[PDB]
Ligand binder design. Structure first.
Ligand SMILES: [K+]
Ligand SMILES: [K+]
Ligand SMILES: [Rb+]
Ligand SMILES: [Rb+]
Ligand SMILES: [Rb+]
Ligand SMILES: [Rb+]
Lengths: 94, 90, 90, 94
């Protein structure tokens, strides 16, 4: 078990929870839409919508700067600790 | 190089999976479904988004499932594409 | 850590430079100019684009000038932000 | 002088030239807008516009897959061979 991976996972879940609550409260999005906006923002995919309120713009700025680094670290650890071992195991002739 | 070959195959299958899902669930044309799948997993982004809740949840999982895969494929593809030029001018 | 400090400063100045340019040349409000600068250099992207040719050329140069800087800053910021949690649960 | 950096530079310039010509021809954009769309696409920033024609969609797909890797490699080499040495030199007390 990788502690760095566990922390990055919990931090990402809390980050996405925080984003969902914020955008559904301040920007008036449905929780599902708020979660989607948080995910596509922190993975840098982006969305067709932007925050309308100045508070949403400021939060999104800070959210982006801390969130991108965490999610990116989680995606890296997810690739090397889970997806890559699973791919390798699944390529073994049995 | 079997490393690049497997990354290609995985990327193809992932993109196929997205094209099928978005063309059937989100009603996009196949070419538009593929485009959405590609720009989503490469993080270029689109000027549309899934309008169904089912499509939103899928795109979230689709991103985490495929974003790292496509990143690895783009890297290996870059190496193979530029290596002839590096070797020629060297 | 002076490494993180200099990356912070450089990022601040780059973002300030974009906010000034986009608020004056592209007529955005300062907060919107900053938002555009941030989402452009982090590659999140925006639902607008510069409408003047001068703004387009600037954003092209602005991307190549700052994209690598912000990437390095986001990495160092990530390390500093998560390191207390790593150490606490270890 | 770094040959890898030189090749990555020339390849990026040719890639952006190719994109500009394509999008101004097939998608009917002004050359400046075509170049902008090529840059923001290959850096993954994205644009508010998407290709309208099916040929533009297919080209953009292939363009993205080859273009992102090259531009990303150029940006890396630009950071380590040019921007970072320049920053370090500019931080030297004189
Ligand atoms: K975008
Ligand atoms: K967009
Ligand atoms: Rb809400
Ligand atoms: Rb044109
Ligand atoms: Rb991106
Ligand atoms: Rb984007």
């Amino acid at each position: 078990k990788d502690k760095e991976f566990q922390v990055l996972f919990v931090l990402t879940i809390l980050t996405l929870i925080s984003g969902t609550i914020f955008y559904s409260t301040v920007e008036g999005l449905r929780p599902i839409d708020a979660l989607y906006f948080s995910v596509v923002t922190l993975t840098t995919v982006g969305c067709d919508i932007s925050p309308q309120t100045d508070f949403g713009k400021i939060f999104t700025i800070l959210y982006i700067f801390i969130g991108i680094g965490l999610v990116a670290g989680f995606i890296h650890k997810l690739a090397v600790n889970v997806q890559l071992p699973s791919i390798l195991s699944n390529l073994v002739p049995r």
